[PDB]
Design an enzyme around this catalytic site. Sequence first.
Site, PDB file in Angstrom:
ATOM      1  CD  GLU A  95      10.757  78.763  40.750  1.00 43.39           C
ATOM      2  OE1 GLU A  95      11.286  79.888  40.626  1.00 43.39           O
ATOM      3  OE2 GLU A  95      11.415  77.702  40.774  1.00 43.39           O
TER       4      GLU A  95
ATOM      5  CG  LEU B 109       5.679  79.015  33.176  1.00 43.57           C
ATOM      6  CD1 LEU B 109       7.168  79.105  32.870  1.00 43.57           C
ATOM      7  CD2 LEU B 109       4.944  78.275  32.077  1.00 43.57           C
TER       8      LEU B 109
END
Lengths: 432, 432, 430, 430
Positions: free
Chosen positions: A247, A245
């Site tokens: 990223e 998440l």
Amino acid sequence: MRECISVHIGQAGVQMGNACWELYCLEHGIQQDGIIPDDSSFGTFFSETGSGKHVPRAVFVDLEQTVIGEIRTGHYRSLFHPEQLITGKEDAANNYARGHYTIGKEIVDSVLDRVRKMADQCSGLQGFLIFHSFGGGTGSGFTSLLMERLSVDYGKKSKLEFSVYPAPQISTAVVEPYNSILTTHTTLEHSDCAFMVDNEAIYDICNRNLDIERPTYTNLNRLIGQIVSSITASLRFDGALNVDLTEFQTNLVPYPRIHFPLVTYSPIISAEKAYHEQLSVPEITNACFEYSNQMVKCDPRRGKYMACCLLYRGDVVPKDVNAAIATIKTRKSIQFVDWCPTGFKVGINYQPPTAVPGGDLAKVQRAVCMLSNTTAIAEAWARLDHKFDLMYSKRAFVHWYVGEGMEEGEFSEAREDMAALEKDYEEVGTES
Amino acid sequence: MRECISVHIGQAGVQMGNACWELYCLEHGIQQDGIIPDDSSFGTFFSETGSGKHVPRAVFVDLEQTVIGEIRTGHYRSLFHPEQLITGKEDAANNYARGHYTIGKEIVDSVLDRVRKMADQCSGLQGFLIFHSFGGGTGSGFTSLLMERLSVDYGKKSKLEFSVYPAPQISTAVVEPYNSILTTHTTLEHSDCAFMVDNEAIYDICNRNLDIERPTYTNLNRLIGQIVSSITASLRFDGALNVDLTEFQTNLVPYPRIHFPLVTYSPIISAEKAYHEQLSVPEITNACFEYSNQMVKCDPRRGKYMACCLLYRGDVVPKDVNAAIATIKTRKSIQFVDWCPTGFKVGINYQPPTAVPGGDLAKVQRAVCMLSNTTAIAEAWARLDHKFDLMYSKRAFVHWYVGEGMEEGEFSEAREDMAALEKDYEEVGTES
Amino acid sequence: MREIVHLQAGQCGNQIGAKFWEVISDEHGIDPTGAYHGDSDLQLERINVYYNEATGGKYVPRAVLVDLEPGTMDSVRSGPFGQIFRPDNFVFGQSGAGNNWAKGHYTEGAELVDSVLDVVRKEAESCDCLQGFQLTHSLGGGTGSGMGTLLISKIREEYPDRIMNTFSVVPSPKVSDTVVEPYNATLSVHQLVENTDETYCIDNEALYDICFRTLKLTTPTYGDLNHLVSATMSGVTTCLRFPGQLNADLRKLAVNMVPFPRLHFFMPGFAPLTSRGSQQYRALTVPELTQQMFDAKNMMAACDPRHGRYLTVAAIFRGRMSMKEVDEQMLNVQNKNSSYFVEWIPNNVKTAVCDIPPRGLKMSATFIGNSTAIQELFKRISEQFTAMFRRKAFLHWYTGEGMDEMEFTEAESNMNDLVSEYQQYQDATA
Amino acid sequence: MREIVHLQAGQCGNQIGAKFWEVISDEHGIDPTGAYHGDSDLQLERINVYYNEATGGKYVPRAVLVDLEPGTMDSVRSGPFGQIFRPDNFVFGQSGAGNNWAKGHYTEGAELVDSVLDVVRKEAESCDCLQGFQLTHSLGGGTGSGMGTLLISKIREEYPDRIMNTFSVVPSPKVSDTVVEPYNATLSVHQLVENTDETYCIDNEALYDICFRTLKLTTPTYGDLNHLVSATMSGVTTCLRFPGQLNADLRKLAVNMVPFPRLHFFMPGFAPLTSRGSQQYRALTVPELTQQMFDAKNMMAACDPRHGRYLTVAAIFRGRMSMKEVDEQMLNVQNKNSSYFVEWIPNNVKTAVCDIPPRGLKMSATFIGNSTAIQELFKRISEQFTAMFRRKAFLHWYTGEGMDEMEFTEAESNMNDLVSEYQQYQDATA
Ligand SMILES: Nc1nc2c(ncn2[C@@H]2O[C@H](COP(=O)(O)OP(=O)(O)OP(=O)(O)O)[C@@H](O)[C@H]2O)c(=O)[nH]1
Ligand SMILES: Nc1nc2c(ncn2[C@@H]2O[C@H](COP(=O)(O)OP(=O)(O)OP(=O)(O)O)[C@@H](O)[C@H]2O)c(=O)[nH]1
Ligand SMILES: Nc1nc2c(ncn2[C@@H]2O[C@H](COP(=O)(O)OP(=O)(O)O)[C@@H](O)[C@H]2O)c(=O)[nH]1
Ligand SMILES: Nc1nc2c(ncn2[C@@H]2O[C@H](COP(=O)(O)OP(=O)(O)O)[C@@H](O)[C@H]2O)c(=O)[nH]1
Ligand SMILES: [Mg+2]
Ligand SMILES: [Mg+2]
């Protein structure tokens, strides 16, 4: 080890939450309660108790008590923690001021407490998934009130939000432009990445590819439920190229104030017509970049792409993905911005998409969800700003907002900020 | 590896398509669906899916929805991809303008999309097989509209078309001369080779050799279906001397604007009278060059041959073909043009012709299809042009065409082009 | 003696590492439980290179598995040969890097590197004679690029004289798995050019061609690619573990393959590589192995050697062979392709022949190439970096963790120097 | 040593080639799987001429199969002796030539020839002593005429000193298999007269007469004709593969059969050829074999030698024979038919005797003839070409691919020169 705190605000978010948690329960084998009959997968979204009861890691909040009361009486009544379901006395009456200033001030201190009790129970905090409506009421006022509280108590932790963006033509409320801009002003600096979906676009998809002439809100929510599952699949299930998440933030957000990716789900295909389709990786991948399949009614070719995240599922060979993306890169119609030669983020997961019983989607082997940040969305904001200018020129409904804690200055500040945002989109769309 | 994209436009093409795909399914062992019960042959025309469903590589388009709706209700309902069957709102009313300018503009963008989705799924593209009527309506307007689109998107790829040419005496519509010339004007520069068939000629064959006094349109389509199978047999099946679709272009087209070969199928013989015939190669080959057996009512001996393609099938010995053609070359009645000493293209295939159950043709061991480009056809164009001049001198029906997007100038341009074409035929018919 | 300590990093490194130990354990006869069940005794003589012994015949890899998230390691221990590792070596955090070099290096891995070194030092101090450190990671991410380079700096500062070799998966030119690859790669390269002795550059795109062209593999999984990478990783460390006619230590390669300190980036290769249906059409002899090793279509890096010249080349053969064939074939390549070899180096081939080949192959050979054509890879990255950096594409994510725009300029300047240096030594004397 | 590399082209070449390797494998005892099961050891001594060895006794033809369409090769590998070939040698495209020389040469094969040479060079470099290249194709089509001539130019430019021999199926006078034969043939001949050392011209019409008259074959398939062509192809390369009293290398034929550079077009023949019912009425001795070899009704080319004179002639005998009979019979033909032989050449017969005959025949003999009567074939083509070219019959198909009308004039002019040259040397001294 991984976790996600899901806050579902308003009728749209709460109703979308039912579709989401009906699907998470399916994918993890849960039985509509906390019971799994005689594993590190379900831990991301569900907390466990010695009795064998798996408790959702979600908070359902609504100043209105009708929709949440339905959950307390529905099939998933025994699933959620009773204190997670927080209901107010009176609704926001489609007014941003009520959700943020008058009523939200009597419920925010309660919902944030349950967020505190959930955050400290996690082995490691990963981010937030906020579901709300952009139209107005609790989804515009309370969300901004809660988002700013999170940005202080939890700071750098990821804060993702899913919003039902107003449709270009379809509209269900008269003061959406007021509420949409007001929440946008107070959420740019507190939100890391907001994913947009439109009712009108999904209606077209549900009638253009799914052969259904009578879409309800239940049908749309199930389509949205699949998208969130694709986003969070990496945490839940193993895969070849996992994506977290945190990223999404650096991959899709080039500049802090431009964090509104679009959404797409390729194999939205009826069961009958799936018998005549190969559904190979190249065709589903190519389907994502077609205007006819976008979940938001904004034509991508009106602007330039600047970030795309392809989240595959099921039997997907990375070689096919490499070739499939490369041919897309070759096409001159699909124009990326000059400053982003590196434009694709690829995520492959082994778990195929599960079809909700009684649904419409086919038993697809492989699915891809595309999260595209495109400059074309600037036109949609321009349309939304145009509606605000007309109503505000006459002060169409200002007396309601001003009478419940808000001030006239906020309308000028809110719109001026959006004008800067539209200008910021113009700067990013040009090179040299 | 090889492929062909079949577009069936209008009632004639669609109805002819049913005969064609009823025969391709037979020759390849398919069961009226995509199912083959418990191979690189069928790949040319049928795409395959993991479920065992073989999907035709064809597009059925018609502004009228009556004929295509019948397919959706017939025995082959489950065969075609539902999106391949494209139906409009209202028909072209036997008007070229409607098919090309008014209604075709709302369906061409849809059919071309499915052509795009089919072209990119092929390992290697070989050409197009377009079936349409020359009489008018969708077969004249929409075909020209679609042909020009293909010439841009796919350029040098082969584009073969099969047309039901207007009969000399028989006629089913009053404005065929208008439509026939208009489509001819807009298809000379976009078509590589057009094969002609006439309703009147096949009626004679069905009653002169087949002993049937009540031919319907079903009988004619089955005869046409055999011809296309003979043309495409090389791709589908192995043979001694194979011929590809791209070979027909340079073999039968000496000049770019003269690309209208005739059609012939020799062993059109009833089952009963086949017991008294040897049906050897020399006799069937000699039958092709007889006026009584041509599929177009244009006498070959009124002009000179300039290109002939003999496509044999079944148990055929190339030695017999060599001798059989040589004796034909000797005959002084069969006069080729001076500039084509090399006048014959020979193709031999091992697969015999399959008789459709419930049909009329006999269980022939060997069959030959002759594709002859002859100067005699210039007379037919002259007759067609003569009809146009009479009606246009009075402006018989121009107000209909002009009222639906077309202009008066097109009638002058269209006919002037045909006059050049007739003149071009005269130049090719003379030497020194 | 001559022990090697293996250090994982990130998802890519751990995935390749898991396959690496599956291959290494296979040729040493180690069961997934750690027991030895091999036939030959030569595979147990030098087992101390990679393994430490325990009671009951259990052999424990001298490997450290580290990542900022628990998921990839959890997959490693659950998969085959996952229980062979020592649990104490799984040094992992909770909050992962979001594919930004700054977080893994300065913010997230900075508080975890100290724990990692506590396992590296413990492993190192247990060696009779430490040879070097082996790091497997990727340059396109945060953990491998950020945290991996942080460990390289720490170890090189703590073990100056030991040889540090890295097997890095390099971003591909054709298509990307991450939008911020140019930022991660350029910053990571700024640390490798200074704190490692030999880096083996490999890109996924090149391995796809090998699977497509040579192996004729129609469903190539990431496990298939990791096998190719594992093969070359094993090949470069066979003389330490098995006898041979002409041995080649890791340092023996560095001296012969690194003329100048900063030109130590290699593009590997392997042979034989044939499909299942084409195996019965090959002689499988030295002359043809050397024929495909120098082929530009059999190297696991994108850069074509034809666009530049080889500074040096190494061919580590395995299996019983005629040394005459090896010497003649290497000379034959030198003579024919004299235009491809730097002239001021009289001999451009280093030959090593190990007696014991890999399981299932009578003969094998690993190709290592230090070519001036590798500047194409670095220059392509520089163009991508400057385009993004020219208008502050994503710096707020990196500068938000503590980095500065000055560091980005320094990283870019160093990369340009390396590209220029490769071009300087591509020209003849005077 | 003295290896030959076989190169297919087009449908005709591949069809003949497949039959050729069926015959060659038969006389060398190679099973369709590649294994050797012959009796005599002499057929294995010189097997390297056509085959490369592999592990387990597998012998792989040194053949390259190429065509712009997949169908003909797919038929080849599916048919008998189809798995013997190496899969890597099937270099094929997708979009075929439409029987136009321009597409196969300039447009379609131009982007595929580079791949073909990558297999030709690999095969060539594996030979201990390369003798020449063997090409089988047809002049009447696009691929064989266009792409085949393109390969001839490439190889002759890359191997100037190696002998290039072609076995071309020539258009027949009586009837055609393609309307554009004159365009394809004339353009193809423009490349052969310059870039090949010996072309063996054969036409299907002549082979039909042989089947009809001599063999009395009532159902002649194309497989039957390819057997006759294969027989002569094998005969001209027996001295390289088997011992004999008087050997004749391919170059040994070229010197004796090519007085001037451009008069290198031959019309082959074979003997004995008898029907099944007439076999018990033949002595099958040297005197009668030579009697039918020079017969105009037993040659696989349309041109009648009676209409011109023989510049040179070759008779490659096979089987154990009396050399006295061969020398006397050849002299007897010379004396009787002195009017048919060019006078300024004192001897017009080259004799070669191989000890081992073809399977099933005690004796055999192949006839090769360089006759001035072959100008009839070329002049007939020229008449057909000029008639079509006089009014731009089909040039838009050729000029549309990049050709120019200037090239057509050059091709026609060169053909006329060749026809004139054949006529010049048909007259006596002074
Ligand atoms: N996609 C989707 N959108 C919904 C759904 N339900 C409501 N909406 C959207 O929500 C918008 C208005 O905000 P609401 O959610 O209805 O109001 P609220 O958040 O409950 O706040 P109150 O006015 O106080 O009730 C409408 O314009 C709808 O488009 C749903 O089930 N699915
Ligand atoms: N051979 C054959 N010809 C047909 C058949 N059906 C119609 N035709 C021919 O089609 C010609 C007229 O064109 P149509 O196909 O009827 O009209 P259309 O293509 O549907 O276009 P619209 O006028 O818009 O309906 C007639 O003159 C017929 O000769 C058929 O089933 N078989
Ligand atoms: N061969 C292989 N390559 C991988 C694997 N996982 C990731 N990669 C590569 O690693 C790059 C992505 O960086 P990644 O390692 O996932 O980010 P990190 O976790 O922060 O180190 C891409 O170039 C991928 O091609 C794997 O399992 N096998
Ligand atoms: N013996 C034999 N001759 C063939 C065969 N196929 C084609 N030919 C000859 O080849 C010529 C036609 O050229 P073709 O090879 O088909 O065109 P291409 O495919 O472009 O090379 C004619 O003279 C045919 O007689 C075959 O299967 N056997
Ligand atoms: Mg409400
Ligand atoms: Mg109609």
